[PDB]
Amino acid sequence: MGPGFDFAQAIMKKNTVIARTEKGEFTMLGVYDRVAVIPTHASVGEIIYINDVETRVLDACALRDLTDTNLEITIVKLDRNQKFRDIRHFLPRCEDDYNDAVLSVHTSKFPNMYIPVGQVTNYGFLNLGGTPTHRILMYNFPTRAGQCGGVVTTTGKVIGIHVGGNGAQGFAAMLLHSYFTD
Numbered sequence: 650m651g652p653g654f655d656f657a658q659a660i661m662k663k664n665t666v667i668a669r670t671e672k673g674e675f676t677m678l679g680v681y682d683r684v685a686v687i688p689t690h691a692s693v694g695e696i697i698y699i700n701d702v703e704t705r706v707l708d709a710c711a712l713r714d715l716t717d718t719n720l721e722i723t724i725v726k727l728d729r730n731q732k733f734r735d736i737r738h739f740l741p742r743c744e745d746d747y748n749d750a751v752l753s754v755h756t757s758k759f760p761n762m763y764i765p766v767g768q769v770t771n772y773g774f775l776n777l778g779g780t781p782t783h784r785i786l787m788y789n790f791p792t793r794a795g796q797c798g799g800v801v802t803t804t805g806k807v808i809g810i811h812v813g814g815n816g817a818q819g820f821a822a823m824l825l826h827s828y829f830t831d
């Protein structure tokens with residue numbers, strides 16, 4: 650509907666796949682080469698379904714900060730025959746607050762979904778499902794089951810992936826450029 654939705658659509662149309670694990674279907678952001686991200690609660694194993702195709706997982710790393718606190722991001726390298734467009738130049742270098750973000754989801758349940766979530770706070774610590782978690786972004790939108798893995802964007806920046814909610818607020822794990830240095 651406007652330039653925020655334009656950037657979000659451009660990311661969804663080229664840099665997402667539908668990932669399926671034993672814990673559900675997730676929006677999955679491809680970052681570069683065969684490297685993608687998903688929430689750690691997806692419990693990625695040795696095999697994952699990508700757009701309903703059986704795909705070997707070459708590597709999976711559940712990230713934690715240097716305090717050994719959960720970040721809720723898992724970086725997955727996929728045994729796929731095709732590379733993602735490299736979007737690492739759209740990743741923030743530092744922790745930050747943002748204005749006027751969009752949360753975008755693409756699954757069997759929620760195809761072509763875009764949500765203007767407004768202001769995003771650097772919330773920091775969250776007890777996420779009983780797990781102490783750091784680097785959490787917060788937005789005041791009542792997000793629902795099915796939106797985990799959704800991409801959080803502003804114009805020109807890919808800032809996080811949706812990992813949970815409390816019925817009134819939604820929470821995303823930050824994406825930082827330093828997670829994807831090769």
Ligand SMILES: CCn1cnc2ccccc21
Nearest residue numbers: 759764790791792793796
């Ligand atoms: C409570 C707002 N909300 C959140 N996720 C949705 C999906 C469909 C319709 C409404 C939705």
